[PDB]
Scaffold this motif. Structure first.
Motif, mmCIF file in Angstrom:
data_model
loop_
_atom_site.group_PDB
_atom_site.id
_atom_site.type_symbol
_atom_site.label_atom_id
_atom_site.label_comp_id
_atom_site.label_asym_id
_atom_site.label_seq_id
_atom_site.Cartn_x
_atom_site.Cartn_y
_atom_site.Cartn_z
ATOM 1 N N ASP A 3 -46.909 92.563 3.278
ATOM 2 C CA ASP A 3 -47.529 91.356 3.780
ATOM 3 C C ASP A 3 -46.763 90.038 3.150
ATOM 4 O OD1 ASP A 3 -49.569 89.755 4.681
ATOM 5 O OD2 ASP A 3 -50.726 89.574 3.128
ATOM 6 N N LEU A 4 -46.735 90.147 1.959
ATOM 7 C CA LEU A 4 -45.688 88.985 1.116
ATOM 8 C C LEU A 4 -44.409 88.975 1.670
ATOM 9 C CD1 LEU A 4 -47.247 88.705 -2.573
ATOM 10 C CD2 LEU A 4 -48.039 87.725 -0.373
ATOM 11 N N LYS A 6 -43.078 89.528 4.566
ATOM 12 C CA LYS A 6 -42.923 88.847 5.984
ATOM 13 C C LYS A 6 -43.044 87.253 5.790
ATOM 14 C CE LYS A 6 -43.183 92.333 9.057
ATOM 15 N NZ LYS A 6 -44.012 93.290 8.632
ATOM 16 N N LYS A 7 -43.830 87.017 4.687
ATOM 17 C CA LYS A 7 -44.100 85.289 4.424
ATOM 18 C C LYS A 7 -43.025 84.750 3.611
ATOM 19 C CE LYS A 7 -49.333 84.926 4.301
ATOM 20 N NZ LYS A 7 -49.651 86.267 3.586
ATOM 21 N N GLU A 10 -40.429 84.279 6.386
ATOM 22 C CA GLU A 10 -40.819 82.949 7.196
ATOM 23 C C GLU A 10 -40.557 81.633 6.340
ATOM 24 O OE1 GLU A 10 -44.781 83.290 8.873
ATOM 25 O OE2 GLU A 10 -44.276 85.088 9.653
ATOM 26 N N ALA A 11 -40.788 81.784 5.024
ATOM 27 C CA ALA A 11 -40.912 80.528 4.097
ATOM 28 C C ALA A 11 -39.350 80.386 3.844
ATOM 29 C CB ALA A 11 -41.717 80.931 2.673
ATOM 30 N N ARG A 16 -39.542 76.151 2.586
ATOM 31 C CA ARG A 16 -40.665 75.824 1.842
ATOM 32 C C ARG A 16 -40.644 76.135 0.560
ATOM 33 N NH1 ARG A 16 -42.865 77.124 7.288
ATOM 34 N NH2 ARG A 16 -43.249 79.060 6.667
ATOM 35 N N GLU A 19 -43.416 77.302 -1.622
ATOM 36 C CA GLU A 19 -44.143 78.199 -1.125
ATOM 37 C C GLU A 19 -43.304 79.687 -1.628
ATOM 38 O OE1 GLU A 19 -45.643 80.752 2.921
ATOM 39 O OE2 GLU A 19 -45.201 78.505 2.941
ATOM 40 N N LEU A 23 -44.542 82.522 -4.067
ATOM 41 C CA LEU A 23 -44.385 84.283 -3.560
ATOM 42 C C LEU A 23 -43.151 84.833 -4.620
ATOM 43 C CD1 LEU A 23 -43.920 83.325 0.078
ATOM 44 C CD2 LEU A 23 -45.336 84.971 -0.777
ATOM 45 N N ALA A 28 -43.230 88.859 -4.466
ATOM 46 C CA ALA A 28 -42.745 88.848 -3.036
ATOM 47 C C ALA A 28 -41.458 89.835 -3.009
ATOM 48 C CB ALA A 28 -42.874 87.822 -2.308
ATOM 49 N N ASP D 83 -51.168 91.772 11.183
ATOM 50 C CA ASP D 83 -49.631 91.443 12.001
ATOM 51 C C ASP D 83 -49.899 90.991 13.544
ATOM 52 O OD1 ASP D 83 -48.654 91.902 9.647
ATOM 53 O OD2 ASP D 83 -47.039 93.304 10.400
#
Ligand code: LMT
Ligand code: MIY
Ligand code: DDR
Ligand code: 8K6
Ligand code: MYS
Ligand code: OCT
Lengths: 157, 240, 144, 457, 240, 48, 48
Positions: A3-4, A6-7, A10-11, A16, A19, A23, A28, D83
């Protein structure tokens, strides 16, 4: 794939920093790769996010991570004219003679888009100037074909 | 006569002729228009800083101003007093003959190495079961610079030496034509000759053009300025 | 077919947009060029404009710009329609005993139903949710 | 789904969504039309949509079995899905309007800055708009984000050396991987298209590129690997343009309490502080809302001026008209209380409902003032005598009309069936306004007439 | 046929063997593209998106489509079924019914409230005749302006009920009062009654005109909606 | 009014003799002296 | 050119005719396809 993870991808891409930092505190995955094999460092080196590149390497990010076609963060930073990031990568043990599946090096890509400062940084860290790709083409062969007068002089060594 | 219907009727017959015309005449773009033959106004464009040449200004007006003026309601015809830039391949017959090449070989090479190819996708539809990757395939794209055109490979010699397009031609960014050259009070200028569409209101159209020009001014380069050397509408406004 | 957003925009969209001049009562123009190989240019006109006159003028300027598009795009065709996104009803056609695929049903509706429904009293426009059959040649590179 | 997701990936999510509606909402849901590969935001493998058709309103009793309730349930139920951004929503009365609070913003490249530089400027405007939750809410891009794409480079020198033409290379690649419409054939007396394309399994992954061979002029078969080189890069899967120039459509709505006009004025302020060469424009409902709001003041003015002049001609007095026109608030207050109490909005049915309530209240007042004035002018009665005689004669007809009309609109107010939203909007505001307009007018119209007749002797 | 396409000759080998198109490719009848996977309750699905023609009746068209689909039922292959996931005509039929219900209920209430106060069936007939005459007249003027029976026009008349019902009540009630207070015969009583209100009724029409007419002169999308109510209400009010 | 113009005659026999395409002759003459619009390219994100 | 009535009707006349639906004041539509490859689709509208 987490979950982290993928974030962070993206970050790191969006740039960011605050962010990314939150993380990096939560733990992460720095080795989080997408379907093409791009880690947060790959993404950060491509989009030219220096502050994040530094934060990832501090947090045990693989500097010589390669995608499904063998391209590394240094390949991207060198190709897209990110001098500041290229230095930080080479400082943190980035393989300067790293070959992709095509046999293309960071020097080839740097030379191809006429990034003079980057070519000098790479050569300083022992970039094989006589390095050829799958077509037997050097960074000098690229400069004379592009007709780059200044670059041709630097690689004349 | 309804000029809208007159245009529709005329073009219906033109489209029967269109396929019988030469391919070169079709690719230049045939135009059907319903405008007054006389000019409503001339919108001049000069550079007060002398940063841009007559050719440079003309390219800007063509590429950044003309199209939006041409689309404005009431604007029947728009004449560019100048020319938009094109990738000019100025061939040398001495150099072409030296390498045993012709303008035929030059044109063939440009069409091959200045191409925008549709190369499909990875994991495209219909896909196999268990496909995770889906990405567009990007092959050859249109060239963007004089340099890129310069390094178009025409042929490789027997000894293995390359003949590029810059070896047989001078490659500069220049007007599609060199027929029109404008001047405002002596200094270099470009601009737009605007003709009023049949039945359209002179004053309402002139106002709509100024409204469109007002939106471009903030995004001009340094020195570039609009001038009003010719306008038939001010008289109507002032005379009434 | 097979084109990306950039390929579609730089060969189709920009060429058509540059030719949308001499059309009356145009307010604004917007377009999308996507990686499915599709482009949609929407020309929105002043309220009270004859939608038929607006459409024929757009169609006419496109016709003159058709020779400037790629042969692959010219071959496929460019559709100029009146944007009236408001359906009376949607008729669904389904296969319950799983003897027909969505392709098989589409061809049947296209061949046997669509034209008859288009002819029905008071029907304006009929869109098929699918396409009629195509002779699909699925090549094998090992064989070639 | 996240960008780069496959068709099969999206089908699994839709299968769960379809399974939910035919399981958890078996008593409400009649059918689920699952369209994989379509979205109003932009079409692709990662996007899909499930059009849910419900049973008859008769079979769905209570507010708990309405789209309002079913929407809220389904949304929360799919928020757990891993997802995937999955949610449900009701359809609007018409697509041709949008939302009254919503705005439609175009961010324009006015100096050939490029796609990547306009993304930076867009991200900058969004970031600043996010620091104003008090004014702007849900300010997002309408378009798609850049995705990984497979850049392959044909070596011209190596192709010419092997004796392989670029037409043969670019055809082989485009035909196999992209498909190629060759020509027409006639299937059972119907002209249909002929497509050549690679069988799925030989055009999925980058390793399959090297399995495709192109014949050289010498007759030898050369693999793609021999004269090609590939790398990963990011590019747009959907490029937007507005009025010929490159653009990026930005959606958003005014924050709870704030107006559309205000939310727009800030977006303009924020936009003026973007990088040089980046312009903006308003489109769709914003273009409409702008050049419709400039008329309103002028239309209110003319309406109010002509009403005065009409009453002035009727009564033959510049002053008396005010006694009639002062009745307007008496009908509007009840409409607002009724709409507010129930939790309705200032919609068109309400707005037109006010004009009919104001119309009938104005009508009642005109006859009272007409009767009162005519007694003073002809029968030579005093102000208070004539006013008291007037309201007496006009009491019954006012009550009969009000009594009949209040009962007449009562079914529309309590309605909870199909098209109840429109019925409620028409009913609630009229009933509420009529009650106050009836009760207050009979006591206030005589007050207005007396005060006006005194103030202007 | 696929058989014909399969037999297409690609090359003839030196030994004599032929290479057909079926030897190097799988040949089937399929879709033009495979982007969209359509399912209806998990089953493979297609369909038709039907729009209403300009100036057409929605209720007639929907019935006509169902009448055509009904004739196609006998020829459908085994398993093929028609479904109606979206249809507005059931909703539009309710809208029409609910409006006629309100308009009829409204006329009934005037009858009851007229009898409650005046207490003679003769007076209750006058508004029962006058109101429908106006409502019918309204439809004639809608047709003259080229308007249709829709949610906005239908609910436009529901909002006007109060205005039309009042016109009837005001006239009859005033005649009933003049007869009671003066003892005039109905003929002479009506003359005096109308003589008091006839000037006000004209004045009211001019005031109500000035309220509703300017609402139609709004521009764009919002203007188009308000125009439906404006014309409907002003027409009904003017006839009343 | 009429003006002097350079009339050039392509000898078909001599071209067929030397084995030169008349298409190549007309292209070479036309492209060089008249100008030939080959295809489009992208100048600062605009088709030219 | 060169196509018989049958081939013409299948590839042209029907393709056009099946798009000539939903037009204002259209009374009827008659068409013919002949051996010379010629199509002629006539659409007749209400008087006025
Ligand atoms: C342009 C728009 C402006 C219009 C605004 C005017 C609103 C309507 C005003 C109504 C006029 C008042 O009318 C009042 O009663 C009647 C008619 O009604 C008039 O009487 C007059 O007209 C009537 C018409 O039947 C005739 O019998 C007679 O020729 C004359 O005496 C009175 O002199 C006046 O006191
Ligand atoms: C919502 N929508 C209209 C639906 C719904 C269900 C479907 O099953 C389909 C659509 C779109 C249509 C568009 C049609 C269109 N056409 C009739 C050929 C079309 O132009 C395309 C296209 N990619 O260009 C389709 O995908 C298409 O063939 C298709 O596969 C569709 C399709 O399968
Ligand atoms: C008796 C005099 C009445 C004066 C009011 C007339 C208003 C008409 C304005 C008009 O044409 O616009 C209608 C408009 C359409 O958007 O509908 C509306 O928004 C309804 C207006 C209700 C508010 C009235 C003002 C009361 C404040 C004290
Ligand atoms: C500064 C903005 C200018 C906008 C002006 C708009 C004017 C619109 C005119 C409306 C017409 C009103 C007519 C109504 C009269 C009917 C009652 C007798
Ligand atoms: C928009 C212009 C018209 C506005 C309405 C004019 C009203 C005139 C009032 C005159 C009053 C005179 C008083 C006499 C003592
Ligand atoms: C259901 C048929 C009625 C159509 C006309 C109704 C007008 C209110």
């Amino acid at each position: 794939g987490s979950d982290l993870g993928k974030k962070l991808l993206e970050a790191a891409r969006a740039g960011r920093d605050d962010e990314v930092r939150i993380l990096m505190a939560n733990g992460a995955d720095v080795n989080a790769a997408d379907v093409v094999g791009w880690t947060p460092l790959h993404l950060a080196a491509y989009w030219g996010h220096l502050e994040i590149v530094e934060v990832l390497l501090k947090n045990g990010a693989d500097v010589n991570a390669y995608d499904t076609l063998g391209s590394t963060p240094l390949h991207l930073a060198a190709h897209f004219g990110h001098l500041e990031i290229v230095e930080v990568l080479l400082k943190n043990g980035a393989d300067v003679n790293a070959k992709d599946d095509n046999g293309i090096t960071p020097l080839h890509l740097a030379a191809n888009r006429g990034h003079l400062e980057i070519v000098e940084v790479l050569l300083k860290y022992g970039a094989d100037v006589n390095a050829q790709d799958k077509f037997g083409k050097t960074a000098f062969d690229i400069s004379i074909n592009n007709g780059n007068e200044d670059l041709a002089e630097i690689l004349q060594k | 006569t309804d000029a809208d219907i007159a245009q529709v009727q005329v073009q219906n017959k033109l489209q029967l002729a269109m396929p019988l015309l030469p391919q070169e005449v079709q690719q230049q773009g045939v135009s059907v228009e319903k405008s007054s033959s006389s000019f409503l106004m001339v919108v001049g464009v000069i550079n007060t800083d002398g940063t841009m040449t007559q050719e440079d200004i003309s390219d800007y007006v063509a590429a950044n101003m003309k199209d939006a003026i041409s689309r404005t309601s009431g604007v029947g015809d728009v004449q560019l007093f100048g020319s938009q830039y094109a990738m000019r391949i100025w061939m040398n017959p001495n150099e072409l003959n030296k390498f045993q090449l012709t303008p035929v070989d030059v044109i063939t090479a440009i069409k091959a190495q200045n191409a925008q190819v549709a190369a499909g996708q990875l994991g495209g539809t219909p896909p196999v079961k268990g496909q995770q990757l889906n990405a567009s395939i990007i092959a050859q794209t249109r060239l963007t610079s004089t340099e890129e055109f310069g390094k178009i490979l025409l042929k490789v010699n027997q000894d293995g030496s390359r003949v590029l397009l810059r070896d047989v031609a001078k490659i500069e960014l220049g007007g599609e034509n060199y027929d029109i050259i404008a001047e405002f009070n002596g200094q270099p200028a470009s601009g737009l000759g605007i003709k009023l569409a049949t039945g359209a209101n002179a004053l309402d159209t002139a106002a709509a053009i100024r409204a469109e020009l007002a939106k471009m001014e903030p995004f001009f380069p340094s020195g570039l300025k609009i001038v009003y050397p010719y306008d038939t509408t001010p008289f109507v406004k002032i005379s009434i | 077919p097979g084109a990306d957003a950039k390929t579609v925009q730089d060969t189709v969209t920009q060429v058509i947009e540059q030719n949308m001049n001499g059309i009356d009562n145009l307010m604004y123009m917007s377009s999308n060029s996507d990686s499915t190989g599709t482009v949609q240019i929407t020309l929105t006109f002043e309220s009270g404009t004859d939608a038929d006159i607006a459409q024929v003028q757009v169609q006419n300027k496109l016709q003159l710009a058709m020779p400037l598009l790629p042969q692959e795009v010219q071959q496929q065709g460019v559709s100029v329609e009146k944007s009236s996104s408001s359906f009376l009803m949607v008729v669904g056609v389904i296969n319950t005993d799983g003897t027909m695929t969505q392709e098989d049903i589409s061809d049947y509706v296209a061949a046997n139903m669509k034209d008859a429904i288009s002819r029905t009293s008071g029907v304006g426009d009929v869109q098929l949710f699918g396409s009629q059959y195509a002779m699909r040649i699925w090549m094998n590179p090992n064989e070639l | 789904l996240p960008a780069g997701a496959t068709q099969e990936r999206t089908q699994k999510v839709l299968n769960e969504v379809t399974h939910y509606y035919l399981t958890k909402e078996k008593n409400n849901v009649e059918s689920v039309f699952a369209v994989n590969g379509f979205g109003f935001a932009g079409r692709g493998q990662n996007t899909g949509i499930a059009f849910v058709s419900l049973k008859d309103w008769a079979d769905r009793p209570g507010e708990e079995n309405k789209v309002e309730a079913i929407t809220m349930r389904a949304t929360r139920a799919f928020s757990q899905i891993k997802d995937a951004m999955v949610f449900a929503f009701n359809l609007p009365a018409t697509v041709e309007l949008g939302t009254a609070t919503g705005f439609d913003f175009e961010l324009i490249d006015q100096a050939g800055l490029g796609h990547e530089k306009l993304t930076q400027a867009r991200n900058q405007l969004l970031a600043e708009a996010a620091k104003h939750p008090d004014m702007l809410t849900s300010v997002r891009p309408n378009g798609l984000e850049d995705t990984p794409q497979f850049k392959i480079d044909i070596d011209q020198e190596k192709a010419q050396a092997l004796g392989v033409s670029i037409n043969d290379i670019n055809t082989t690649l485009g035909a196999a991987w992209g498909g190629s419409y060759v020509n027409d054939f006639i299937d059972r007396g119907r002209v249909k298209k002929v497509y050549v394309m690679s069988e799925a399994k030989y055009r999925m992954l980058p390793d399959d590129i090297g399995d495709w061979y192109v014949r050289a002029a010498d007759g030898q078969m050369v693999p793609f690997s021999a004269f090609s080189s590939s790398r990963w890069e990011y590019g747009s899967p959907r490029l937007e343009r507005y009025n010929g120039l490159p653009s990026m459509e930005i959606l958003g709505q005014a924050a709870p309490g704030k107006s559309t006009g205000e939310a727009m004025e800030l977006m303009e302020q924020l936009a003026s502080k973007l990088p040089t060469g980046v312009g903006y424009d308003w489109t769709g409902m914003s273009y409409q809302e702008r050049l419709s709001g400039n008329q309103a003041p002028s239309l209110y003015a003319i309406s109010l001026i002509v009403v005065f002049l009409c009453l002035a001609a009727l009564y033959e007095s510049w002053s008396i008209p005010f006694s009639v026109m002062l009745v307007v608030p008496l009908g509007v207050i009840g409409a607002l209380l009724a709409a507010t109490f129930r939790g309705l909005t200032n919609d068109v049915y309400f707005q037109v409902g006010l004009l009919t309530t104001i119309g009938l209240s104005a009508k009642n007042a005109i006859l009272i003032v007409e009767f009162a004035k005519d007694l003073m002018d002809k029968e030579g009665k005093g102000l208070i005598e004539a006013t008291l005689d007037a309201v007496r004669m006009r009491l019954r007809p006012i009550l009969m009309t009000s009594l009949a009309f209040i009962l007449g609109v009562m079914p529309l107010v309590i309605s909870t069936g199909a098209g109840s939203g429109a019925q409620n909007a028409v009913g609630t505001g009229v009933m509420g306004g009529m009650v106050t307009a009836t009760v207050l007018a009979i006591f206030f119209v005589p007050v207005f007439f007396v005060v006006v007749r005194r103030r202007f002797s | 046929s696929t058989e014909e396409f399969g037999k297409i000759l690609l090359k003839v080998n030196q030994d004599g063997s032929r290479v057909l198109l079926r030897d190097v490719a799988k040949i089937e009848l399929g879709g033009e593209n495979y982007d969209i996977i359509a399912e209806f309750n998990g089953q493979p699905a297609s369909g038709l998106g039907i729009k209403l023609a300009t100036g057409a009746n929605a209720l007639d068209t929907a019935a006509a489509i169902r009448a055509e689909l009904a004739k196609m039922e006998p020829f459908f292959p085994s398993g093929l079924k028609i479904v109606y996931p979206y249809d507005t005509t059931p909703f539009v039929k309710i809208s029409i019914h609910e409006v006629v219900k309100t308009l009829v209920e409204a006329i009934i209430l005037v009858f009851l409230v007229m009898y409650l106060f005046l207490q003679n069936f003769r007076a209750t007939l006058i508004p029962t005749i006058a109101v429908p005459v106006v409502l019918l007249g309204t439809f004639a003027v809608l047709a003259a302006f080229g308007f249709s029976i829709n949610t906005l026009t239908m609910f436009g008349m529901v909002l006007a009920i109060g205005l039309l019902v009042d016109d009837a009540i005001v006239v009859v009630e005033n005649v009933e009062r003049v007869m009671a207070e003066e003892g005039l015969p109905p003929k002479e009583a009506t003359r005096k009654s109308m003589g008091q209100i006839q000037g006000a009724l004209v004045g009211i029409a001019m005031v109500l005109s000035a309220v509703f007419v300017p609402m139609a002169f709004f521009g764009g999308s919002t203007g188009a909606i308000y125009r439906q109510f404006s014309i409907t209400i002003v027409s009904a009010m003017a006839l009343s």
